[PDB]
Nucleic acid binder design. Structure first.
Ligand SMILES: [Mg+2]
Ligand SMILES: [Mg+2]
Length: 257
DNA sequence: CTAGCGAAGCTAG
């Protein structure tokens, strides 16, 4: 059995208490985090080790930041994308936990389709595809998860017409998401829940979480042997409902053999 | 609207 949660925390300094409450109550075997927004030396290692967790992370000042936190030791830790070796933004970290290759990604947002950050998003997703393919040549059990900043289909958008060919929802971005699906990966949530709105992000503005209008952009993609044992996927809107919350909700997947 | 940086108003999401 194995339980893995992904969360875009948006500043790990701010929401560290909520991370520790997440690791205290029905804790997962693996928790990965995006948007730490703290430098490499500022990670709260001691506070998480006190509770019995191993941590491998990649951080920079102010932006980005990824982390893997697990009960067992994360082995063979890789930083970044080989096809993009000069990108200073800390967005990818991979490690093998309990024989399962975890690839944690905080994907480029893109801002706008006419923004330079969208070209950056394009190249970054290409490099990600190459890295994930090469990693899949070596690991039967693989999970590529995190904040993809891409709503796969219209059912992942509270409103497909105003988001028509807008950032997160454009046909190009969905073709990138499909490029990662074509390597042999399964959208685990859509396997367990083929129908319905399972939004994972709600804009801070306009009380959009209260209106329950958001996007499903936080995903857990799994290899074939992982989908064979895939049993459940849930969006922790309760964490999203907390005071001073992240705009993303945690997402958990549950497997067993 | 929130968070960072840093002292105000951009950048980023
Ligand atoms: Mg955010
Ligand atoms: Mg459409």
């Amino acid at each position: 059995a194995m339980k893995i949660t992904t969360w875009n925390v948006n500043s790990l300094n701010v929401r560290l208490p909520q991370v520790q409450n997440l690791l205290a109550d029905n804790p997962p075997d693996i928790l990965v985090l995006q948007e730490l927004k703290l430098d490499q030396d500022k990670f709260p290692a001691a506070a998480l080790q006190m509770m019995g967790w191993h941590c491998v992370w990649s951080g920079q000042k102010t932006y980005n930041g990824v982390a893997i936190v697990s009960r067992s030791v994360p082995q063979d830790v890789h930083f970044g994308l080989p096809a993009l070796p000069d990108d200073p933004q800390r967005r990818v970290i991979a490690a093998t936990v309990s024989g399962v290759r975890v690839i944690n990604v905080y994907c480029v947002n893109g801002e706008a389709l006419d923004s330079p950050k969208f070209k950056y998003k394009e190249q970054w997703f290409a490099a990600l595809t190459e890295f994930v393919r090469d990693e899949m040549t070596r690991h039967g059990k693989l999970v590529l998860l995190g904040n993809f900043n891409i709503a796969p289909a219209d059912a992942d958008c509270y409103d497909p017409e105003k988001w028509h060919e807008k950032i997160h929802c454009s046909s190009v971005e969905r073709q990138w998401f499909q490029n990662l699906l074509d390597l042999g990966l399964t959208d685990s949530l859509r396997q367990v829940h083929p129908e319905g709105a399972f939004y994972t992000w709600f804009d801070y503005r306009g009380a959009m979480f209260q209106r329950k209008l958001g996007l499903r952009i936080d995903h857990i993609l799994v290899s074939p042997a992982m989908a064979a044992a895939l049993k459940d996927v849930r969006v922790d809107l309760e964490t999203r409902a907390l005071e001073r919350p992240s705009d993303h909700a945690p997402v958990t997947a549950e497997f067993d053999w």
